[PDB]
Amino acid sequence: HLPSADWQRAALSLWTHRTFREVLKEEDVHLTYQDWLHLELEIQPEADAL
Amino acid sequence: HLPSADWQRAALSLWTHRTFREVLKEEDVHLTYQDWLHLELEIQPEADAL
């Protein structure tokens, strides 16, 4: 779909790596609902990638 | 009147002007709801005055 597939491969290899899974359990990094909102609020409807 | 003063003063001075009020009585020009739309829709949100 979107830019060069080695970038996507980096993304998915990191998403799949076990140590990343273990990092996702000692969580101040749980991506709070409000945190995600403070992110999503920022994207204007100009260049959305979607 | 023809001054080269700035546009804000120019436009509002014009809008005050009587003969323009008289022009705004003989209307294929009174800006139908759909006319308003056919101008409005084409603005993008990305660039805008407001």
Swiss-Prot record, chains A, B:
This is Fanconi anemia group A protein. Coiled coil: none annotated. It comes from Homo sapiens. Disulfide bonds: none annotated. It comes from the Eukaryota. Belongs to the multisubunit FA complex composed of FANCA, FANCB, FANCC, FANCE, FANCF, FANCG, FANCL/PHF9 and FANCM. The complex is not found in FA patients. In complex with FANCF, FANCG and FANCL, but not with FANCC, nor FANCE, interacts with HES1; this interaction may be essential for the stability and nuclear localization of FA core complex proteins. The complex with FANCC and FANCG may also include EIF2AK2 and HSP70. Interacts with FAAP20/C1orf86; interaction is direct. It is linked to Fanconi anemia, complementation group A: A disorder affecting all bone marrow elements and resulting in anemia, leukopenia and thrombopenia. It is associated with cardiac, renal and limb malformations, dermal pigmentary changes, and a predisposition to the development of malignancies. At the cellular level it is associated with hypersensitivity to DNA-damaging agents, chromosomal instability (increased chromosome breakage) and defective DNA repair. DNA repair protein that may operate in a postreplication repair or a cell cycle checkpoint function. May be involved in interstrand DNA cross-link repair and in the maintenance of normal chromosome stability. It is found in: Nucleus; Cytoplasm. The chain holds residues 897 to 946 of 1455 of the full protein. Phosphorylation is required for the formation of the nuclear complex. Not phosphorylated in cells derived from groups A, B, C, E, F, G, and H.
